[PDB]
Design a protein that fits this description.
Largest sheet of chain A: 7 strands, mixed
Chains A, B, C: Fusion glycoprotein F0
PDB class: viral protein
Strand order of the largest sheet of chain A: 14-15-1-9-12-13-16
Oligomer: homotrimer
Radius of gyration of chain A: 33 Å
Assembly: trimeric
Bound molecules: a molecule of 2 linked components (NAG-NAG), 2-acetamido-2-deoxy-beta-D-glucopyranose
Entry title: Crystal structure of prefusion Hendra virus F protein
Helix content of chain A: 25-40%
Keywords: prefusion form, viral glycoprotein, ectodomain, viral protein
Structural class of chain A: alpha+beta
Strand content of chain A: 25-35%
């Protein structure tokens, strides 16, 4: 049950931190306008057909989004038109419902079109008639206002236009990854606010700040954006930002296991067991922490990332160490000792351990996997080049007298898995014929005992 | 033959979109000059030895490319039987050890040489280009473009701030720009690009030398976006000039062809019920069918799109006969895995008909007012307008079509495949477990 | 020596380059100050509360580093260096060692810190300061250049909100850029893994200047061997001290990395590719796998920031050393897996899959169905036309009749993630099914 830490530590898995488990929930919606063509009316003398190009270029990347969105709109007549939609995922359907929900306010924001069209500055605060405000973030506007405008004199009219064309095209080449043919499904709310901000030049800080515990959300990619309206004549979008909160899962924790090479039968092994185990309620399972934000106190995820675990690997973690698979160590880099509870767990065959206080070297038998070193043999431990003072071990009084039973060896390598598999299939097939040497030589040579009876 | 779509949909894999399959082919080559040191002729007043430094710094990252390229140029002693279009001969002994890809890139390099040499004659005019992008005449009426790094910054920041800023400031700002640009280009062009006799480099990646602005680079040259987002527009470095600090890039702008009777079928996955628990099917979500043959495809590397999967190469991959069999009827061969996340999807829509896990989620009929409840004997419900016109599904209301398949999808039971664990760590334990077991029962056969 | 290159080449793995094996060692520490709030007193006019905001914002991302660092400092009580095990409680070796290095950095950190008020008022982007000894120390300050060469000149023709917008925007952009590396994300700052590139995110990614002010550099850089450790955080002046670990790389002895160039091959009416590592590490008499993906591959060497060796199954070992019937093979279904390679100036080609011909002798080079691959050298063709590429050949230094002698092909296998589970469960099902007949 709920983890056999000591048994585990001998096989080279020492207790790491225990962590709180958190997931986003309870989203909270807020709307923003991002304008994708800058102002220019203040510096319109020496532009040329850069705009006529940029616009039709932008229209090419923008229109298919509009098109994709509108297929959910003309076809949600609360109720979504299943025949019209035809083939879709639940996720998408829900995004579509959120979209329809956004429409009501989208429509009200859209009434300020001509005022959006003529925004002077980078970030503008507008009045949506209610006393409910709405923000317009316009791309390259700052550059235009504070580079182009003041350098106008010392540049000329054929080289301001170059500087403009270049800015526009750079901005384009930057936004293209996120907003290209690439975002094929824009009826979603997965797009991270960071990724959306690409349209405002990656400055998601300002985007969040004008809307007004933050970083933890941000670095879990839990702050998401949904595109809810596209205006093709004014070249702006409305984004609904989903700013959630994060909730602690109840009697759920994520246990880290610190891996440490260990000795068996003249060679160093490392245990093949998850380094992060999720325990919620009485149930132990795998978790894909790679997708979360690990943190001193908590694993923070934008969704549940639990994953099933085989009963062997479950048994392994709760005592049966002869079920934890082990792999050969051949790199001078897999770690050779760890510290847990102020007590040291060390491969004193691989590395040389000594007692600074008592002067005598701490030497490890070949019969043992690992040493548990605490303040009842050394107070201070010299460990190569690092000197470390130890606590008393809260576990078994004679950890080092009692021997763990090591599990089976295995190869972890992609290429070695296939060879192992074909090797095995070979062996099982080879010995699946000897079992067919009994369909005759135990059936006919026993139904001959019906004739040698009758 | 066909995928057994109905049998599949019970095991929680519903028909998604069917897509065209496209791959790039027939490049149309076009050449461009990228100059990697800006002008500074209109600034040379406060420049310390930052140019003297920057140059020798750049030479360090540039020269080995040149060197690498020129080993193919000395080694292709070619035109075969002297003549231009007769062909090209690569020196095998000289080259020694190379890949087909590389050899071909070498041939393309030799092919680029002819025009490279003609472009190179404008060296002194490249050397003194004033502006960021310049159009030059290669004598023929055939034009050639020079894109020069940091030039714009220099022309529109520094020259304008020169009257208002000092010296050990004007030079700081320059040193900083140059070193930033350097630290940005270093990933793509460093010791990293060990094999420059290639045409893999994407034009985006190449444009790192022009500060990531691949837009302008493409636009000065001339289905564009679909090419671009499949990384099918590639660049090859064909000449390096170490005194003028410029490179010639051959850009390979291809076209994309529809593969014939080949389509990529999406399967939308849906959690399904069996023996008191939710399972998800372990079967590819994307299957490539070309001709009568079904095989895997690595779409992760392609560009997926309403109508088509667009790839810069063929990405087909073999498929085990079991997983083949599974997709064409034998659902007892489709492996399944336990579901333990409140996130794996619980229903899908295909053909206007709903496939739902009405054990996991709670389904009801808005029109008929009665809840749609699912037996524990069944994996999944197919709900079509012949039981509900409108379906309330938690919080989403949805109007349905008539299912074009079996009149009683729900009365007939599928046979669920074997359970399996998908996890990296779990595969090793499963394997060692099995070895142990087979060895253990390989002695009883010796009894 | 170790490997069986000829036997291997028939199964479609031809000798590629042999490379030197190098790892970083012998690091060489040098210190630097990164200031994360620009000067701005030269436009202290209409900034507004943006500084008051920016500062408290920054404090939020910065303080937890300080905090984390100081827990090692508070708990290394020494000179004998002794680390407090009870206080530390639960840590890795790596981290402990980082801690020792941190304590080692403290001595100089403390001396650098005396110049606090002079750090506070640095005018320019990069400054050289005197740490009293004649030992200099550098201050790189963020956004300073932008401020000095955009905003200060663009004061005169810009409104008071206009100036402050441009500032707020620069600051917040810089923030949104640094946040990935320095956020809640860097949960363990008592380490020296952070690459100097990643560190330079605080100076706006310009790791070039950072390295250049401190003074075979690229190979280090592109192996991510040049690392930074944060050794001090100042929360009132908003600067950090970084100890940069600039190592040197050493050749491993009698160790090389062998590349294998893969080439589709023919067997029993279909094209196969061999499932064998493309890079094999041989050090001493021992052959093993190596994870090159993490290193820097280079004409002469594989360059790694650590040893990346990995064990190899005795079957795959045996395979590379003769037993080709142990090298697993997989069916080819993509018009993209390569069809010929060149090694030693001799050609190894699938002349069933592609059509091979002799330009010199005019006659086409055709391959039996009994053979996997053709070895083509100048003793049959001097020049070879191979689709659209013409190539002149050397003499093969191996067996005089490579093409008469047949290799024994290994077992077929499926490589695919999804196909492994089915293979595994199939093998299970079958073993269970035939584990009952043994109970009969
Ligand atoms: C769905 O309906 C939208 C409107 O909601 C359609 O947009 C119209 O587009 C035409 C262009 O030919 C314009 O003349 C109209 O002004 C638009 N309609 C309205 C009411 O403003 C769109 O064509 C429809 N189709 C799809 C597939 O989304
Ligand atoms: C159940 O769904 C089918 C197909 O979605 C509906 O049949 C269509 O009805 C519309 C409107 O009457 C016609 O324009 C189509 O031509 C019909 N298609 C077919 C293939 O018959 C049907 O109406 C739905 N049933 C109910 C009760 O709404
Ligand atoms: C070991 O740990 C702590 C040190 O304070 C203490 O409680 C205990 O008495 C110590 N025991 C010995 C034998 O040193
Ligand atoms: C370290 O100790 C001092 C007390 O003298 C205190 O000011 C500081 O906050 C402590 N920090 C930690 C992390 O314990
Ligand atoms: C192959 O090439 C080299 C040329 O130096 C030579 O050693 C060898 O004799 C050649 N043989 C033939 C048949 O061309």
């Amino acid at each position: 049950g709920i983890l056999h830490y000591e048994k585990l530590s001998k096989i080279g898995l020492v207790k790491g931190i225990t962590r709180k488990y958190k997931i986003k929930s309870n989203p909270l919606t807020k709307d923003i306008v991002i304008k994708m063509k800058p102002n220019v009316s203040n510096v319109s003398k020496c532009t040329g057909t850069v705009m006529e190009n940029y616009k039709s270029r932008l229209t090419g990347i923008l229109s298919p989004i509009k098109g994709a969105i509108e297929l959910y709109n003309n076809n949600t007549h609360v109720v979504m038109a299943g025949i019209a939609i035809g083939i879709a995922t639940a996720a998408q359907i829900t995004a579509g419902v959120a979209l329809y929900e956004a429409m009501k306010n989208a429509d009200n924001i859209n009434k300020l079109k001509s005022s959006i069209e003529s925004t002077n500055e980078a970030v503008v605060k507008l009045q949506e008639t209610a006393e409910k405000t709405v923000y317009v973030l316009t791309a390259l506007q700052d550059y235009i206002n504070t580079n182009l405008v003041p350098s106008i004199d010392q540049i000329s009219c054929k080289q301001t236009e170059l500087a403009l064309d270049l800015a526009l095209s750079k901005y384009l080449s930057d936004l293209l990854f996120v907003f290209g043919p690439n975002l094929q499904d824009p009826v979603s709310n997965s797009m991270t606010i960071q990724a959306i901000s690409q349209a405002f030049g990656g400055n998601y800080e300002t985007l969040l700040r004008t809307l007004g515990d933050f970083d933890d959300l941000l670095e879990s990619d839990s702050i998401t954006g949904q595109i809810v309206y596209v205006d093709l004549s004014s070249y702006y979008i409305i984004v609904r930002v989903y700013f959630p909160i994060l909730t602690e899962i109840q009697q759920a924790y994520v246990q880290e296991l610190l891996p440490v090479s260990f000795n068996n039968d003249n060679s160093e092994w490392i245990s093949i067991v998850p380094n992060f185990v999720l325990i919620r309620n009485t149930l132990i399972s795998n978790i894909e922490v790679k997708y979360c934000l690990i943190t001193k106190k908590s694993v923070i995820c934008n969704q549940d990332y639990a994953t099933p675990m085989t009963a062997s690997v479950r048994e392994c973690l709760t005592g049966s160490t002869d079920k934890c698979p082990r792999e050969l160590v051949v790199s001078s880099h897999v770690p050779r000792f760890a510290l847990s509870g102020g007590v040291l767990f060390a491969n004193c065959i691989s590395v040389t351990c000594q007692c600074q206080t008592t002067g005598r070297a701490i030497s490890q038998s070949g019969e043992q996997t690992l040493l548990m070193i605490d303040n009842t043999t050394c107070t201070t431990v010299v460990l190569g080049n690092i000197i470390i003072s130890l606590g008393k071990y809260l576990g078994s009084i004679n950890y080092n007298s009692e021997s763990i039973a090591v599990g089976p060896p295995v190869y972890t390598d992609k290429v070695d898995i296939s060879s192992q598999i074909s090797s095995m299939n070979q062996s099982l097939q080879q010995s699946k014929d000897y079992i067919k040497e009994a369909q005759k030589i135990l059936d006919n040579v026993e139904d001959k005992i019906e004739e040698i009876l009758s």
